[PDB]
Assembly symmetry: T
Homo-oligomer: 165 residues x 12
C-alpha cells in the first residue's frame, strides 16, 4: 500500500512528518476534552471568570485538531482520532483532578501545558529538515498555545513573579 | 451536599448516572464523527465531508449541555479520554480511510446504538426528572434527523437500505 | 424497510400517518396566510399585512420539519398541490379581497381547526413517539400565540370576541 | 375600480390575468420543489437536497411579487390551494421517493413548461405593461439558471442530456 | 465635450432633460414624503408613520441614481431647492397636520402624477437610451408598489377608493 | 464613604436622593409599559403592541444607568418591588384589558408626571452635578418623544387631544 | 368568553392562575436580579456583575412569554408593581451593598423558592395543558442552570455550600 | 386653535422654541439637498476622495432634519418640510456653484457652513432660557456640523494655517 | 443538443457567440483593472487605488454571470488565458508604473471600447433573446457609471477631458 | 488664522489650551491602562484583564475626539510621546507586575486626578464654548463609571476603601 | 529606485523576479479554476461546482498580495493577459465541457506544478527575504490542502489515485 | 522565575529584551501615526486622513501582541509614557501641521528605522525562539506594505522619491 503525497516530498520525509502530526493530533484531542473537563469541574469565588476563559481555548484547540488531521491526510496517510487512537498515542497520565478549586485545576493544567508546549517545540525543530509548511502550521499553534498557559500561569503568579503552585 | 430544589438525592443520583453515560457517548460520537470527516474518499466526497461538521458541532454542544446538567444535579461530570473509555459499552470505530459508502454504512450502525439507547433513557427519565427528560428528547430529534441524512445516501429507490453490515 | 431505532414497525406507520396530515394542514395554512396577506384592505392594512409574513414563514418552516420527520420514520412525505387537497378535511378559504376584520375573523375559524386537530394529534402520540409529540407541542404554542394576535384585533373591552 | 396610472382599464385586466396564472404556476412550483427536497435518495443526496432550498425560497418569493403586482393592478390575487389547481395546465408531480436522477429528470420537464410559458407571457406584455414584463424577464433568468443546474446533473461529456 | 460611448450628442441631451425632470420630482417626493411622516395623526398613526420611511429612503436613493446618470451623460444635475422649484410643474404639497386618511388620499394624487409622468418618460426613452429606460422601469415598479400600499388603506371592501379628492 | 472626585459629600447625597426617585419611576414605568403591551386590544392592536417594546427596552436601560450612577456616587440603589412602592408617589396603573385608545390616553397622563418630575430634577441638578444633569436631559428627549407617539394616536385633525 | 381551541374554561382558568403567579415571580426575580447586579462588591466584582445580566434579560423574556400565554388563554395579565406584591409569597430581597458571597448566598435561597414552585406547576400542569407545561419546563432548565452558577461560587472542593 | 405641549412648558415658551426649530429644519433640508448637489458636480484629480466624504454628512444631516422636525411636532406645532417651506424660511441665496472643481465647491461650502454653524450657535444660547432639552439636541448637531466644516477647511488650508479661498 | 426552452438552436447559438466575446472582454478587463490597481502612483494614490477594487469585484461577477448563461444556452464557456487572447480584439493594456492621470486616461479609452461593443450586443440581442439582453443592459449601467468616475478625475470645470 | 464660526479668537485659544492638556491626559491614560492590562496577576486576573480593554478603547477614541476638536478650533494638536510628557503634571505610573488589588488601588488614584481636572475644565468652559463643554461632559460620565468599577473591587461591605 | 529597508537592490530584484512568476501562475490558476467551475458536469456537479469558488477567491487574493509585494520591493507587477502568457511555462488548460472526474484529475496535475514550483521558490527565498518566504509558505498550505480536496474525489478505498 | 516550557532562561531574557525595545517602538508609532492623522492638510487630505487609521489600529494591536509575549516569557512589559521615551533611539516626530506630502515624506523615514530594526531583530531571533520570530515576521509584512502606501504618494512616474 502506497501511492500519493505532496508534490516535492519524498515518501520517507512524508511519513516521518505524518507520524509526527499524528502524535500531535492525539495530543490536541486529549487536550480539548480535558479542557472541557476543567470547564465543568471548577468551583470557588472566581468560578465564572475561569469557566469562560477556557471556551475560546477549547474551540481554538479543536480547530487545530482538524487542521493537523487533514494535513496528515494531505500527506497521504490516515488520521486516527477515535477515543482509542487517543489512548494509544497518549504518553501521559489521564487528567486526575475533578470537581475541585480553580487554583487546583489551574495548577494542574499548567503542567499539562508544559507537556504540550515542550513536545510541540521539539516537533518544530524536527520539522525544519522535513517540511517547512508543516513547521509553520505548528509554530502558529505554539504561539496561541503558549499564550493560554500564560493566562493560566498569571492566575497562580506571586505578587513578585514566582509561580504559586 | 446539594441538588436541584425539589429533587430527592435518590432520583438525582439516578439521573446523574444516566446522563454521565449519555455524556461519554456524545464524546465518543463527536470524536468519531470527525474521524470519518477526515477519512472519507470518493466522488461524493465534498458533499459528505461538509455535511458532518454541523453534526459534530451540535453533538459537541450536547456534551457540554449534559455535563453541566450532571453538575447542576450535584455530581461531577467526567470528560477525559480515560472516562469516555470506561463508560464505553461498545467498541472503537474501526473504519479508516475508506469510501463514503463504507463510512456512512458503519455510521448508521453507530447511530442505531446511540438513538436507541437514548430513547430508553427517555421513558426511563419520565419518573426521575421531566426537565432532563425534555433535554434528551430535544437531542434525539436532531440525532434522528441526522441519521436520516445518513440513511438517505444508502437508501435505494424504493426504500431499502444497502448496509454492507456483514 | 427501515425506521427510527426503537419504534415498532406499526407505531412508526401510525405516527407517520398523523404527520402527513399535519403536513397538508401546514401547507394549506401558509398558502392561505399568504393569500390574505395580499387581499386585506382598510385603515389598518399595513399593520396586519406585515403581521402575516412572520407566521407564514414560521408555519412554512413547520411543514419542512414534519415532512422531514416523516421521511426519518421510513415513509414518504407528500407535498404536491394534489396531495394537500386529498388530505383536506375543510374547505378552501373563501374570502377574496375584503376588509382586515373580514379576513381576521375568517382566519380565526381556520386556526380553530388547526389548533384543535393539532391538540388531538399530540395526545395520540403520548403513547407512540415522545420525540414526535414534543415537536407538535412546540408548533401548537406558536400557532396558539398567533391566533391570540388575530383575536386581539377582534376582541372588545369585555374580552368578548366580536366576529 | 382603480388601476396603475397610465394603463387602460382593458390592458390592466389582461396583464392581471396573465400574472394570476404565473402565480399559480409559481405556487405549484415551490410546493413541488420542496416535495422532491424530501423525497430524493442516493449517493449524492445532500448536494442536490441542499440545492433545492435556495430555489424554493427564490420562486417562493416570486409568487409574493406577482400576486402583489396583480393587486396593484386592481384585481385580486388567488393563492389558496383550490385556486392553484383551477389554473393548473399540467399534472401533479408524480414521482414519490426515488433517486436523485429520477427527480432531476422529472424536474427538468416541469421547468420546460414554466420556462416556456413564462417566455410566452413576456412577449404578450411587450405591448401591455413594460414594468410588468421586466419583472418576468428577471424571473426567467433565474428559473433558466436553475434548470441548467438540474440539467448539469444529467448531462454527459458530449453535452447530450441523458434523461 | 463628452458623453456615453455610442450615444449621439442629440439623444444624450434629450435623455439628460428627461432625467433632470425626473430628478426634481424625486427630490420633491422624498421631501414631501417626510412631510406627512411627521404630520399624520390618528389611531392608525404608528403603522403609517413607519411605513413611509423605507419609501423615503428608496426615493432618496433614486434621486442619487438619476443625477449621476445625468452626469454620466455629460450634462450637470441640479439638486438645490431653487432648481427643484423651477422644474416643478405641480404645486407644493398642501396638507399639514391632518389625519392618516387625509394624507394618504392626497398622496395617492401625488403618485398618480409621478407614476404616470414616469411611464411617459419610459416609452419615450425607448428610442434614446435603453439603459436609462431600464433604470426608470426599475423605479416605476417600486413607486407603483408603494402607491398600492397607499390605496389599500383607502380601498373599500369590494374595491372602490374613498378619495376625498374634491 | 467615597464619592465622585470633586463633589462635596453633600451635593453627592442630594443627587443620589434625586436619582433614586427617578430609578423607581423608571422601574414602575417599564413594568407598566409591558403591562399595556399585553392588555391592549382593538383594530390597531399589533401597531401599538409593538410600538411599546422599544420604549420598554429604553426605559429599562435608563433604570440601569441611573442606578449605577447612584452607586458611583457612593450610595446604594434600591430596585426591588418594595423599594419601588416606597419611593412611588403615584398609584398603580388601573387599566387592565381595555381598548388601545384608552391605554394610550391613560399612558399619556402617566408620562405627564414622569416628564414633569424629570424636568424639575433636571433643574435642581444644574447646581449639584452636570454630568448627572446631562444624563436626565438625554432621557427626557426620548421620554418626551414617546409621549408624542402616544398623543399622535389621540390627536384630532387640528391639534386637540381626546382622552 | 373565549379560550384556546380544545380547552375547557375550567382547565383554562386553572392554568391562567398558575401562570399569573409565575409571572409575578419572574417580575420580582428580574428586578431583584438587576438589584444585586448593582450592589455587589468585592475582588470578584466584574465577573459576577456581568454574569447576572444575561440571566436578567432571560427572565424578562420569560415573563413576557408567560403573560401573553395568559392572554391567549383568555384572561388578563397583571404586571404592575402593585400586582407583584399581591401575588408575592416571599419577602422583599433584603441585601443592600454587600460582598459577592453575601448576595450569591441570598440569591441561592431565592432560586430555591422559584425552582420549587416552578417544578410544582409543571407537574400540576400535566393534567391541565401540556403546551404550557412544556413552556415552564424550558424555563426550569435555564433557571436551574443559573442557580448552579451561583452555587459553583459558594462550593468548596467537596461539593459543599458555604452560606 | 391650541391644545397640547410638553409637560412643564408654557405655550409661549413652546412657540418660541418651535419657531426656532422650524427655521433650523428648513436649514437642514436646504443643506442636505445642497450637499448632494456638490456630491455630484465635483471634478478634479481628487474627485473620489471628496465624492464619498460627503455622503456620511448628507445622511447625518438628513437625520437631524427628522429629529428637529419631530421635536417641533412634540411641542405641539406642525413641521413644514416641503420644497416651498424651505424657500420661504430660507434667508440665503440658493447654491450657485455647479459642475466645477473640488476646490471651487469646498470653498463655497465653507461659507455655507459658516452660515449654518453661526445660526445654530445663536439658537443654542437663545434656547438656554427656553428649553434645555432642545438646546442639548442642537448642541449635538453643532459638534458634528462643525467637525465636517473642518474636514472641508482642511482641504483648503495653507501649509501654515491660513485658508486658501 | 439542448437549449433554453423556447429558443431555436440558431437563435441560441448566435447569443452564445455574443456572450463568449463579452466573457473574454470581462476577463481582460478585470485583470487589467486589477493591473492598474497596483501600478498607480501619485498624490491622489489611495483614492484611486481603492476605487478600482469594487469595479474589479463587480466585473469578476459579470464574467461568471455571462459564462454560466452560455452554458445554460447549451454551449461551453472558455475562460483560460489562451481563450482571452483568441477573442481579444484590442491590445494588451500597455501602461506600467505611472501617475493616476496616465492610467485613468488609458482606462478611459479601454472603457470606450467595452461600452461600445456592449451597447451593440444589447441591440443585436433584441431579436435573439430578451433575457440575455436584460442581463447585458444591467452590466452596461455599472460599466458606464464607473467610466464616469474615471472621467470625473480628468474633467476640468467645463466638462472637458484632459487626456 | 481661522476658527469656529461665531467664536472670539481669544476664546477659541483658551478652549484649545484646555483641550490640549486634556489630550495628553487621555494619551497617558490609554497607555497606562494597557500597561496595567499586561502586568496584572492574581486569582481574579482574567476578569480585570478583560475589563480594562473596553476603557482603553474608549479613552483612545476620546484622544481623537478632543484632538480633532483642537484642529477644528484652528490650532494644532500635539500627540507624540514628547508632547504627552511635556503636558504631564503627574508622575509616570510606577507599578510594574503586581496584584490586581495593587494596580486597581493605584488606578483609583490616577482617575481622581483625571476626573477632577476634567470637571475643572468643564466648569471653565461653561462661558467659553458650550459645544466643547458638552463633549467633555460625555467623557466624564464614562470615566467616572469606570472608576466605580475600579472601586467596587476595593470596596468593603460597608462602602469604604482599602488602598 | 527604492526598495524594502534592509535589502540589497539585488536580493530585492531577485525576489521580485520570483514573485512575478508566481503572480502569473496564480492569475492563470484562478482563471482556470473558474473555467472548471462552469464546464463540470455529472451526478456530483453541484458539490464540485461550489467547492471551487472558495479556492478561486483565495487564489485571486494571493495574486493581489504577491503583486503588491512586488511593487513594495520597488519593481512593477504585470497582470494583463499578455504578461500572464509571457511568464507562463505550462500550456493552456485543455479540458472543456467534460466530466467532473476528468477535470479533477486534470486539475490535480495543474497543482502538482503550482505546488512543486512554489516549494522550489520557498527555498530560493530562505536567503533573499524571509517576509516573502513566509508569505509563499502560507499560500502553500492552502494550495496543498485544496489539491487534497481534489485527490479525495479520485482516491481508491486504500490510497491509490485514478486519473 | 518561570518561562516558556523548553527555553533557556538566558535565551528567554535575550528575547524579552528585543521585544521590549520593539514594544516602545510600536507605542511611539501608534501615537505618531494618529499625530499626523490630525495634522495633515492639503487637497488629498481626506484620503490620507482615513488611510492612517487602519494602520494605527494594527500597530496598536501589535503593541499588545508583543507586550503579552514579553509577559509570557516571564519578564514584565513597560508600556507607560516614560518607558517609551527611555527605549527611544530616535527623535520625537517634529512635524506639526503641514502638508500631506510633508508628513508622508517624514513617515517614510520613520518607517525605515522601524522596518530596519525589525528585520535586525528577526535575524537575531532565528536561533533564539522561532515562535517569536514568526510573530515579528508577520508584523514586518504589514509594516512594509504600509510604507509602500506612503511612498506611492511620493513616488515619481519612474520609481523615484521626492522628500
Ligand atoms: Na408526559
Ligand atoms: Na423592448
Ligand atoms: Na448650562
Ligand atoms: Na528557518
Amino acid at each position: 500500500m502506497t501511492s500519493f503525497t505532496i508534490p516535492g516530498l519524498s515518501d520517507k520525509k512524508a511519513s516521518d512528518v505524518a507520524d509526527l502530526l499524528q502524535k500531535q493530533l492525539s495530543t490536541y484531542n486529549d487536550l480539548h476534552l480535558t479542557l472541557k473537563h476543567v470547564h465543568w469541574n471548577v468551583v470557588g469565588p472566581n468560578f465564572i471568570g475561569v469557566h469562560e476563559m477556557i471556551d475560546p481555548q477549547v474551540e481554538l484547540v479543536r480547530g487545530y485538531a482538524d487542521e493537523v488531521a487533514e494535513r496528515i491526510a494531505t500527506l497521504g496517510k490516515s488520521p486516527k482520532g477515535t477515543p482509542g487512537a487517543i489512548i494509544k498515542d497518549r504518553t501521559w497520565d489521564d487528567y486526575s483532578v475533578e470537581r475541585d478549586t480553580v487554583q487546583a485545576h489551574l495548577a494542574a493544567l499548567d503542567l499539562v501545558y508544559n507537556g504540550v508546549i515542550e513536545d510541540t517545540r521539539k516537533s518544530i525543530e524536527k520539522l525544519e529538515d522535513l517540511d517547512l509548511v508543516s513547521q509553520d502550521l505548528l509554530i502558529a499553534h505554539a504561539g496561541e498555545l503558549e499564550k493560554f498557559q500564560w493566562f493560566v500561569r498569571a492566575h497562580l503568579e506571586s505578587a513578585g513573579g514566582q509561580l504559586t503552585h
